[PDB]
Design an enzyme around this catalytic site. Structure first.
Site, short mmCIF file in Angstrom:
data_model
loop_
_atom_site.label_atom_id
_atom_site.label_comp_id
_atom_site.label_asym_id
_atom_site.label_seq_id
_atom_site.Cartn_x
_atom_site.Cartn_y
_atom_site.Cartn_z
N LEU A 53 31.77 34.61 42.01
CA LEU A 53 32.35 34.43 40.66
C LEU A 53 33.43 35.47 40.56
O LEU A 53 33.29 36.57 41.15
CB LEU A 53 31.30 34.64 39.54
CG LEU A 53 30.06 33.75 39.45
CD1 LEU A 53 29.17 34.26 38.36
CD2 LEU A 53 30.41 32.30 39.21
N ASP A 54 34.51 35.20 39.82
CA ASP A 54 35.48 36.27 39.75
C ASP A 54 35.00 37.37 38.80
O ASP A 54 33.92 37.26 38.17
CB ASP A 54 36.95 35.77 39.54
CG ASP A 54 37.17 35.03 38.23
OD1 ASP A 54 36.60 35.40 37.14
OD2 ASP A 54 37.98 34.07 38.29
N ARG A 55 35.75 38.46 38.78
CA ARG A 55 35.34 39.67 38.13
C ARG A 55 35.05 39.42 36.69
O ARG A 55 34.01 39.85 36.20
CB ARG A 55 36.39 40.78 38.29
CG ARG A 55 35.93 42.16 37.69
CD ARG A 55 37.06 43.25 37.67
NE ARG A 55 38.10 42.85 36.66
CZ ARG A 55 39.40 42.59 36.92
NH1 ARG A 55 39.94 42.75 38.16
NH2 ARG A 55 40.20 42.18 35.94
#
EC number: 5.4.99.24
Length: 229
Positions: A53-55
Site C-alpha cells: 500500500l502506498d505511504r
C-alpha cells in the site's frame, strides 16, 4: 490506542495488518525503515509483504510468514483470485455508468525513490472497477476494486476519470481539498483505504475475508459530509 488493533489477523501462515495512513510499508531509497523492517527487528524467520500500500493509503495489508504462504498468495494475485476493495473519497459526482477504467499506466521513479505514475496508451494494461457507495454535495465515496495491482492505479484511474481523490498531493485537486477543509471535515490525509481483502488461506484452503475499520479522521470526514447537506 490501540496498538493491538493494527493486527487484523495472525496465524503461522500470514499476518494481516490495518496499515495506518502515514506509515511506509518498507524503507525508502535512503536512510529509512517501514513496517516490514520494523517487524523483522522483533525476530531470522521468513517475513515478506505479499503486496504494497502506498505511504498515505491505510487499511488491509497482507504479510506472508511462510514461503509456502507467499507462493500461494503470489499465485492468487497473478490469477486475479484475490478481491481487494478500497474506499476512496473522490471529487464531484462519480457517474453511475462508469463501472471501470481501463487506462494503461507508466511509472517513473524519481531521485527520491518516490513514484509518479501516468496514463500512457503505451503503458502496462491496467483495470479498476468502481461502484458508488455514497453521494455527498460535492464528492462521492466510491468502492474501488483494482483488478490489476499497479502502482498508484486507483489514484491515477480516479483522476483520469475526472474524480481525483481527496488530499492526493500528486494527482489531486487543491481546490477540492480547500472545499473539504471549509466544509469542516477535518480531513488531513489521502482519502484512500483498503477496506476488505478476500483471498484463499494458503494453509487451510478456506476462503477468508479480512476488513479494516477506517480511522477516526476518515469517519469524521464522512459524517461531516453526510450531515452537511
Amino acid at each position: 490506542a490501540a496498538l493491538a488493533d493494527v493486527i487484523l489477523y495472525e496465524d503461522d501462515h500470514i499476518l494481516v495488518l490495518n496499515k495506518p495512513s502515514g506509515t511506509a510499508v518498507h524503507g525508502g531509497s535512503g536512510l529509512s525503515f517501514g513496517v516490514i523492517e520494523g517487524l523483522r527487528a522483533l525476530r531470522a524467520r521468513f517475513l515478506e509483504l505479499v503486496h504494497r500500500l502506498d505511504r498515505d493509503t491505510s487499511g488491509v495489508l497482507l504479510v506472508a510468514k511462510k514461503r509456502s504462504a507467499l507462493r500461494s498468495l503470489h499465485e492468487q494475485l497473478r490469477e486475479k483470485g484475490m478481491q481487494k476493495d478500497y474506499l476512496a473519497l473522490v471529487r464531484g459526482q462519480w457517474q453511475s455508468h462508469v463501472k471501470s477504467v481501463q487506462a494503461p499506466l507508466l511509472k517513473n521513479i524519481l531521485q527520491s525513490g518516490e513514484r509518479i505514475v501516468r496514463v500512457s496508451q503505451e503503458g502496462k494494461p491496467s483495470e479498476t472497477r468502481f461502484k458508488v457507495e455514497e453521494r455527498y454535495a460535492f464528492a462521492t465515496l466510491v468502492r474501488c476494486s483494482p483488478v490489476t495491482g499497479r502502482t498508484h492505479q486507483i489514484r491515477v484511474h480516479t483522476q483520469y476519470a475526472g474524480h481525483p481523490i481527496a488530499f492526493d498531493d500528486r494527482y489531486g485537486d487543491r481546490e477540492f481539498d480547500r472545499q473539504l477543509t471549509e466544509a469542516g471535515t477535518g480531513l488531513n490525509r489521502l482519502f484512500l483505504h483498503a477496506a476488505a481483502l478476500k483471498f484463499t488461506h494458503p494453509g487451510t484452503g478456506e476462503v477468508m475475508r479480512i476488513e479494516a475499520p477506517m480511522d477516526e479522521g476518515l469517519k469524521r470526514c464522512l459524517q461531516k459530509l453526510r450531515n452537511a447537506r
